[PDB]
Amino acid sequence: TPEFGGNLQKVLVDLIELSLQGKQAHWNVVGSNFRDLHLQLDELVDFAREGSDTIAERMRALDAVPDGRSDTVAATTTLPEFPAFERSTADVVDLITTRINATVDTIRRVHDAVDAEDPSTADLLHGLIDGLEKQAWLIRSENRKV
Amino acid sequence: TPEFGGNLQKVLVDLIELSLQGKQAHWNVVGSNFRDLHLQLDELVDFAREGSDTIAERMRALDAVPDGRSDTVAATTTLPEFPAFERSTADVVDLITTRINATVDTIRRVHDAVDAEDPSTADLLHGLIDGLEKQAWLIRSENRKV
Amino acid sequence: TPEFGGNLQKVLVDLIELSLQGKQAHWNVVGSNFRDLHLQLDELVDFAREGSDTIAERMRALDAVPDGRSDTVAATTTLPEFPAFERSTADVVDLITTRINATVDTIRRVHDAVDAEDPSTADLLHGLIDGLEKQAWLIRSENRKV
Amino acid sequence: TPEFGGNLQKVLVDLIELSLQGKQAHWNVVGSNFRDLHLQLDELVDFAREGSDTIAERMRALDAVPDGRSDTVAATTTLPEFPAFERSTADVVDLITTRINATVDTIRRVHDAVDAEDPSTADLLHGLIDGLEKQAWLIRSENRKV
Amino acid sequence: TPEFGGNLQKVLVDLIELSLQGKQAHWNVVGSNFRDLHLQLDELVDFAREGSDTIAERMRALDAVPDGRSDTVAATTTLPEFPAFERSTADVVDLITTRINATVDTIRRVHDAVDAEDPSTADLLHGLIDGLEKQAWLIRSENRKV
Amino acid sequence: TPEFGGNLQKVLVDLIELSLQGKQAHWNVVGSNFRDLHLQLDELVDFAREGSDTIAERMRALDAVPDGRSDTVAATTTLPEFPAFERSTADVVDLITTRINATVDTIRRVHDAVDAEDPSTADLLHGLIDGLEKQAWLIRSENRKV
Amino acid sequence: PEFGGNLQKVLVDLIELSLQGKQAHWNVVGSNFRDLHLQLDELVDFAREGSDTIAERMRALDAVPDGRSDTVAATTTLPEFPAFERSTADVVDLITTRINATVDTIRRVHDAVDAEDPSTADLLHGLIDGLEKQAWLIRSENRKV
Amino acid sequence: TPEFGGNLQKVLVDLIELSLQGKQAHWNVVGSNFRDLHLQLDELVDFAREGSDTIAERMRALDAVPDGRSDTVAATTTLPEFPAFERSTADVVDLITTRINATVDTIRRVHDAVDAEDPSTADLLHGLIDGLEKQAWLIRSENRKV
Amino acid sequence: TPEFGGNLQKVLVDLIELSLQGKQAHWNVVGSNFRDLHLQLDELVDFAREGSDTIAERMRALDAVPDGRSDTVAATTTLPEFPAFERSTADVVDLITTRINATVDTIRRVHDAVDAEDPSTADLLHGLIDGLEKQAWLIRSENRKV
Amino acid sequence: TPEFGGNLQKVLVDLIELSLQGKQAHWNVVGSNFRDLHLQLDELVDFAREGSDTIAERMRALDAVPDGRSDTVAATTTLPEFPAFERSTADVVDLITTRINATVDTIRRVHDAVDAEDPSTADLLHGLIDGLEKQAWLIRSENRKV
Amino acid sequence: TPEFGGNLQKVLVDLIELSLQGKQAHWNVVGSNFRDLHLQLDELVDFAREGSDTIAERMRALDAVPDGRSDTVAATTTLPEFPAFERSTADVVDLITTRINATVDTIRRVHDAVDAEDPSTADLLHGLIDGLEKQAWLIRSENRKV
Amino acid sequence: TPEFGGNLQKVLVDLIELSLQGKQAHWNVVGSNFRDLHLQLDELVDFAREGSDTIAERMRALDAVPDGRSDTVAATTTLPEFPAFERSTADVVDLITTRINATVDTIRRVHDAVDAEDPSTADLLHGLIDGLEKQAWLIRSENRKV
């Protein structure tokens, strides 16, 4: 259905934007605990790319047309823009946490309709939520107060 | 130097645009001889991602500031936009060949200044142009009729 | 739960019959773009065998009695018979697409009944839908004209 | 959410107790099919450890605090204690079957609440039920007669 | 030659029947020494599937048409029909021994004509014979007494 | 001898308690320099589990009876308990260092009695010292101030 | 000595086939290009392995190999290959014809080589199997029905 | 030292005899738990071969002359000769247990002089004792009753 | 087929004696070009062990009883005894060449009688000839002068 | 350009001739220190084949026509012919060194034009010079006497 | 030429000194963020060893005489002396950054003559500069504050 | 204790000097058996580096500080100097044998105090002696007269 296709397209553009932001932060981060932040951003980008590809193949299987162009992503993404200069570790961790939370929350919005329509795709969304939440936890644990 | 940083930034944004659009074509292509294009476009995307990461790390080592944001890519890329909807294999082969030719032409234009300033970065450009030209040959040989 | 056992037996019989047809077509197919089909049918057979074994072991865990005999498969399968001679690639692609469609439609009918009892087996069926539909798309894209 | 944390803590403590008791049986089992039981119990312990780690990371990523201390396990576990000395093969198979049945029963009680609140955790619990039931079948098949 | 194709088709259909028999027994076997029988039957199925695929590819290379449909298997198989329900260890090992012996006996009768016509295919037949005989030894040696 | 068996059982209890407490710390740790501790405590738990299994199998080979039940561990362990809530990274490093020091000092007491009978087991005890002391240094170096 | 001569004739044909496969691998264009490109590389690898196996076996049987380029050019029986870009159908046809000639000479030598040494007969049987499988797997592209 | 050479020669000849015994039993064993015995005897043969090679290379490094000839082994080894025909499971397990016990007893007598002269070789002896005793446990634990 | 069994026993005895002599030379060889011989004799022993195991399992599959005892191989082997002291590289090369020639001569002599009954075993004999003759060529080329 | 195409064609035919030459020497060489040269020539052949394939793919990418036919190689090669029959190792090393030096001389002669035209291809020639010179040293230092 | 040999010898001794000093720092680094520095210094040592070996093999191929003795390194190195004892992480990061900068600066000075004489060796120098600069950036970014 | 630390430092500097001279001989050796010595010395350098790192980690764990600087090695090492020119293979083999003998002599000298203070460290020294003596034999067997 066109509604299902549109929801999956909104998820896909958010995943692509998240991957691009992760790579940009991976390149442009400075500060403490550099090696771990560097490796974690790479792992997150790999996982996000794999999830985006899986969504693309599934949505193709359901006979929909994907929209993953750069202009389309820039026009329809929901993630906030990222700073273009070198950033401290606390700031980049905070920004990554916020972006991951927004990406997860969009999927949590669409989950009800996706489960009502196709449990097979609901399972892929469940796996994506699991992976993204694990990544978000392991990153956000750096800046915890206690 | 800022001009050197800008010359590398143009290459970086071109590679990111190429990778995203190659993934788009990988998801979207249908028609005769589908599987060969489906696999080779994935290989092209992998190579483009590796090259973009290599350029980002090298230019960071040379103390410059990357701009890999989606908005920046959309605003300052040189590759023409990818047409939407399902496309035939011949058309996608032609479009990918033209775009890879544009990218390698950009590499050729920047190569003079890059070699004049840093031979180490010139070597990375040589490797990238070699790989991209090999990919371009393997793609365009599909549509050749002799 | 005799109804659960019968439903899972109907699933397994169709999976085994489809695997046999896939192997026969893999051995028999010939024509334009032969190699891609030759490899993809092998991949589909491997996936079908993995799914059939997984279903059989799950249904064993639930204390049911599987029936995987050749006579039982031939007597209780739902998929149509396959041509016995050399077939063109377009025809074999169409036949394989029809077979995958019938198999996934069978799981679609049994889905609600099996989810009424066991969400765990529902998850396995979701995975089978994901894989089979991905294979169906990747094969049917061969004959698509647009 | 505190109730959710409580159910997940019960799951984690049951899994930890199962792993410890399985290692006990692994070191202690003597009798016929000794090598078979030795390998299978090691596989069961490995799977239980993987599942316990997955559950712990999931619930802690959902902002809960795990309690996997030995005193907590002893005080709040639900599995009955293991024999103290060398046991026959049939007896240890029966004991392990009973332990796995109790664990999966607890998971089944928790399943309703987890499906009510977080489908992502429900999916992990489904996978755990699948793995534990497969192991239980493979173990209990030793003692079953015709 | 048509007679050569007929003998190779007989061997192929026998191997397919053996693979189906092995998988069914693998799923269904219950009793003593169960884990080892479970692993050995899976190994036998893997070997039988590889041999059947090898014969199919060879006969296709020699310009013959294979017949691996389930209906054809049921109509032209030579292995006697297998029990329907759960069976003890002695019964299953004895039955598997009888089917393997029947298969190798059929291959033995075909071997004379195959060696008369094509020694290259005769070598593949020899490999199948001794692999199957090794598997038969490992299986029947369980029931043997002193 | 029963005294040797009791000493080995006491060592095994300490190893199991250390592994469980390490997993607790791995789950519950939070604060600055997270990922390093998160990976390193997992490595320590893996090594401790390997050592505990090896020592259990060795003591079984020497014809003794292991006691690895949760109640037995809680009743006869020597390592003091772990905090039940989220702790700072410096504190968890200090506690883990203390636990490892207690465990290795227990081995230091038991070593003379072990070597008085069995140099082969003394070698395994030496290996345990090597691994645990390397891990202890690798953890304690976090808070070292020169 | 005749045994050595037959094995030398086999070896030069295998080397020529490997060179033919590499040439077609580099110089092929048209439809199904990626599949033909991979298949020809696999065939070249198999031909090189078979040539090595024959060379080492015949060395073990105390003969003197002749695998020089001049010797191959003077003694091989495979037809000459075109030196320009060729369509895929023509490439498949030419490769099929060359493989058929190569397996034909092996079948011709098989009787004497098996009568003299079953161990070498086994290696030649394996080579026949592999090359015939490759021949079918390539020639299936241009089949009519 | 000639006495050192003689002790290590006795060790080597005993290891070679044990390897031959294990391989013969591996080929010849028939009865219950056949596949487990077949795998374990192969593992024991592999371990014995590795240990024999290690002892030979160590003794050669210490400027002695190894004697691994079959005639020397037959004339010098202390392990009693094996049955010549097919043997039952209990009998072969008992025979292997007795052979391993004799070998480790010989190693124990030699270990005193070995530790007196060269601790480096004493370490290898300890490793061999550990491995052989573990294998002996996995063997003799088969026939043990409660 | 007692004659067949005796022939296969003669093959097995020769292979075992060859492996033992190869290990002895591998331990004892010394002189110019030492390392190449040291590695190649190890490879020869590995191949001989593989061949001996293959022959033993094949003759077990043919319902025969092998005799691989040390006394049996010493009293039945045909290979000449090996020097017991340090030997020059040329001498050990000559001795190994002679031993391999005797071993392959035995197989060539028994080949006609073997093929008179079982072509599958004849195939294994062909493979053994191939491997042993390759090893013989590599050994003999060391001392060749031209 | 045709002159550049011919410049690379000379390199290609020289590499193919070198590969066949190395294979001939690998098969034919006998004498002292056999195994070292036997493995080294195989490594040389592998490197030459990889380099020839790389040059062929690059020159295809740059839209030229390879001529790798055996007749073309024989007619236009530059390496001296290899004498037949069995040759001593010293003569083989001398001839291989001379031919590799000739190939490196050809590469160096064409390198000026190649670098003036295409730096990407110049890099490939640099890599080939590195590899071939390393092989030349690793072979020629055999015959060196201080 | 002797000048080229000396220019390469200076780079070789600098690389050896850098590798030894990196190992020194790997051993005596303590403080906050220990593990990341501990791993990065090991990676740097591995890269330095690989580069030093590559330079040694290349300069050997070009018929020069290496001087990698400890006395020669101590006498002719250019890197400043590394202070002993345990050092804080900030200080060791600064020291390693300064040393890598000195090494790459020396390589930059020698690059002109190296490129003027042998472009192949210039390529190796380019690769070494790339790797060392990447490592230097990845280490120095730890201490950066923005 | 300071004496323990000093002895471990004496061992470490000897290992580092041995590794450096091994690399020098690896680069510098020419003559017969060149490939054999080239591989063997590379293996010895790898082993020496691993052993030196292991000693550094252990003595760090025991709260001591290493001195592995180039100046410290040159001032404190006990190994004789290595020639700086091209040497015959016999001479380099003799020199390496002498160096290994000196290195193992130092460790055997310190072994008494090391065992009196820490059996675990004595075990590491035993392993180092075993490895170094094996390498020493495997090298010096080249130049043996008889």
Side-chain angles (χ1 to χ4, degrees), chain F residues 68-97:
Chain F
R69 295 169 296 161
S70 56
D71 304 80
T72 305
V73 171
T76 69
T77 187
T78 69
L79 309 185
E81 69 275 16
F82 199 80
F85 323 121
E86 293 173 319
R87 291 320 211 171
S88 179
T89 51
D91 300 347
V92 66
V93 171
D94 183 75
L95 276 296
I96 292 298
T97 295

Coordinates of all heavy atoms in Angstrom, one line a residue, chain F residues 68-97:
Chain F
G68 N 29.9 -26.7 42.3 CA 29.7 -25.4 41.7 C 28.3 -24.8 41.7 O 28.0 -23.9 41.0
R69 N 27.5 -25.4 42.6 CA 26.1 -24.9 42.8 C 26.2 -23.4 43.3 O 27.1 -23.0 44.0 CB 25.3 -25.7 43.7 CG 25.1 -27.2 43.2 CD 24.5 -28.0 44.3 NE 25.5 -28.2 45.4 CZ 25.2 -28.6 46.6 NH1 23.9 -28.9 46.9 NH2 26.1 -28.8 47.5
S70 N 25.1 -22.7 43.0 CA 25.0 -21.3 43.4 C 25.0 -21.1 44.9 O 25.6 -20.3 45.5 CB 23.8 -20.6 42.8 OG 22.6 -21.4 43.1
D71 N 24.3 -22.0 45.6 CA 24.2 -22.0 47.0 C 25.6 -22.3 47.6 O 26.0 -21.6 48.6 CB 23.2 -23.0 47.6 CG 21.8 -22.8 47.0 OD1 21.6 -23.2 45.8 OD2 21.0 -22.1 47.7
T72 N 26.3 -23.3 47.1 CA 27.6 -23.6 47.6 C 28.6 -22.4 47.4 O 29.4 -22.1 48.2 CB 28.2 -24.8 46.9 OG1 27.2 -25.9 47.1 CG2 29.5 -25.2 47.4
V73 N 28.5 -21.7 46.2 CA 29.4 -20.6 45.9 C 29.1 -19.5 46.9 O 30.0 -18.9 47.5 CB 29.2 -20.1 44.5 CG1 29.9 -18.8 44.3 CG2 29.7 -21.2 43.5
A74 N 27.8 -19.2 47.1 CA 27.4 -18.1 48.0 C 27.8 -18.4 49.5 O 28.1 -17.5 50.2 CB 25.9 -17.8 48.0
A75 N 27.8 -19.7 49.9 CA 28.1 -20.1 51.2 C 29.6 -20.2 51.5 O 30.1 -19.9 52.6 CB 27.5 -21.4 51.6
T76 N 30.4 -20.5 50.5 CA 31.9 -20.8 50.7 C 32.8 -19.9 49.9 O 34.0 -20.1 49.9 CB 32.2 -22.2 50.4 OG1 32.1 -22.4 48.9 CG2 31.3 -23.2 51.1
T77 N 32.3 -18.8 49.2 CA 33.2 -17.9 48.5 C 34.0 -17.1 49.5 O 33.6 -16.9 50.7 CB 32.5 -17.1 47.6 OG1 33.4 -16.3 46.8 CG2 31.5 -16.1 48.3
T78 N 35.1 -16.5 49.1 CA 36.0 -15.7 49.9 C 35.9 -14.2 49.4 O 36.3 -13.3 50.2 CB 37.4 -16.1 49.9 OG1 38.0 -16.0 48.6 CG2 37.5 -17.6 50.2
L79 N 35.5 -14.0 48.2 CA 35.4 -12.6 47.7 C 34.2 -11.9 48.3 O 33.1 -12.4 48.2 CB 35.3 -12.6 46.1 CG 36.3 -13.4 45.4 CD1 36.2 -13.2 43.9 CD2 37.7 -13.1 45.8
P80 N 34.4 -10.7 48.8 CA 33.3 -9.9 49.3 C 32.3 -9.4 48.2 O 32.7 -9.4 47.1 CB 34.0 -8.7 50.0 CG 35.4 -9.2 50.3 CD 35.7 -10.0 49.1
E81 N 31.1 -9.2 48.6 CA 30.1 -8.8 47.7 C 30.4 -7.5 46.9 O 31.2 -6.7 47.3 CB 28.7 -8.7 48.4 CG 28.6 -7.5 49.3 CD 29.2 -7.7 50.7 OE1 29.9 -8.7 50.9 OE2 28.9 -6.9 51.6
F82 N 29.6 -7.3 45.8 CA 29.7 -6.2 44.9 C 28.5 -5.3 45.1 O 27.4 -5.7 45.5 CB 29.6 -6.7 43.5 CG 30.1 -5.7 42.4 CD1 31.4 -5.5 42.2 CD2 29.2 -5.0 41.7 CE1 31.9 -4.6 41.3 CE2 29.6 -4.1 40.7 CZ 30.9 -3.9 40.5
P83 N 28.6 -4.0 44.9 CA 27.5 -3.0 45.1 C 26.4 -3.4 44.1 O 26.7 -3.8 42.9 CB 28.1 -1.7 44.8 CG 29.6 -1.8 45.2 CD 29.9 -3.2 44.8
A84 N 25.2 -3.1 44.5 CA 24.0 -3.5 43.7 C 23.5 -2.5 42.7 O 22.6 -2.8 41.9 CB 22.9 -3.9 44.6
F85 N 24.1 -1.3 42.7 CA 23.6 -0.2 41.8 C 24.7 0.3 40.9 O 25.8 -0.2 40.9 CB 23.0 0.9 42.6 CG 22.3 0.5 43.9 CD1 22.7 1.0 45.1 CD2 21.2 -0.3 43.8 CE1 22.0 0.6 46.3 CE2 20.5 -0.7 44.9 CZ 20.9 -0.3 46.2
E86 N 24.4 1.3 40.1 CA 25.3 1.9 39.2 C 26.5 2.6 40.0 O 26.3 3.3 40.9 CB 24.6 3.0 38.3 CG 23.7 2.4 37.3 CD 22.9 3.4 36.6 OE1 22.5 4.4 37.2 OE2 22.6 3.2 35.4
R87 N 27.7 2.3 39.5 CA 28.9 2.8 40.2 C 29.8 3.5 39.2 O 29.7 3.3 38.0 CB 29.7 1.6 40.8 CG 29.0 1.0 42.0 CD 28.3 2.0 42.9 NE 28.3 1.6 44.3 CZ 27.9 2.3 45.3 NH1 27.6 3.6 45.1 NH2 27.9 1.8 46.6
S88 N 30.6 4.4 39.7 CA 31.5 5.2 38.9 C 32.6 4.2 38.4 O 32.9 3.2 39.0 CB 32.1 6.3 39.7 OG 33.1 7.0 38.9
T89 N 33.3 4.6 37.4 CA 34.3 3.8 36.7 C 35.5 3.6 37.6 O 36.1 2.5 37.7 CB 34.7 4.3 35.4 OG1 35.0 5.7 35.5 CG2 33.5 4.2 34.4
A90 N 35.9 4.7 38.3 CA 37.1 4.5 39.2 C 36.8 3.6 40.3 O 37.6 2.7 40.7 CB 37.4 5.9 39.8
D91 N 35.6 3.6 40.9 CA 35.2 2.7 42.0 C 35.1 1.3 41.5 O 35.6 0.4 42.2 CB 33.8 3.1 42.6 CG 33.9 4.6 43.1 OD1 35.0 5.1 43.3 OD2 32.8 5.1 43.5
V92 N 34.6 1.0 40.3 CA 34.5 -0.3 39.9 C 35.8 -0.9 39.5 O 36.1 -2.1 39.8 CB 33.5 -0.5 38.7 CG1 34.0 0.3 37.5 CG2 33.2 -1.9 38.4
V93 N 36.7 0.0 39.0 CA 38.1 -0.5 38.8 C 38.8 -0.9 40.1 O 39.4 -1.9 40.2 CB 38.9 0.6 38.1 CG1 40.4 0.3 38.1 CG2 38.4 0.8 36.7
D94 N 38.6 0.0 41.1 CA 39.2 -0.4 42.4 C 38.6 -1.7 43.0 O 39.4 -2.5 43.5 CB 38.9 0.8 43.4 CG 39.6 0.5 44.8 OD1 40.8 0.7 44.9 OD2 38.9 0.2 45.7
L95 N 37.3 -1.9 42.9 CA 36.7 -3.1 43.4 C 37.2 -4.3 42.7 O 37.5 -5.4 43.3 CB 35.2 -3.0 43.5 CG 34.5 -2.3 44.6 CD1 34.8 -3.1 45.9 CD2 34.9 -0.9 44.9
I96 N 37.2 -4.2 41.3 CA 37.7 -5.3 40.5 C 39.1 -5.7 40.8 O 39.5 -6.9 40.9 CB 37.5 -5.1 39.0 CG1 36.0 -5.0 38.7 CG2 38.2 -6.1 38.2 CD1 35.3 -6.3 39.0
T97 N 40.0 -4.7 41.0 CA 41.4 -4.9 41.4 C 41.4 -5.6 42.7 O 42.2 -6.6 42.9 CB 42.1 -3.6 41.5 OG1 42.2 -3.0 40.1 CG2 43.5 -3.8 42.0

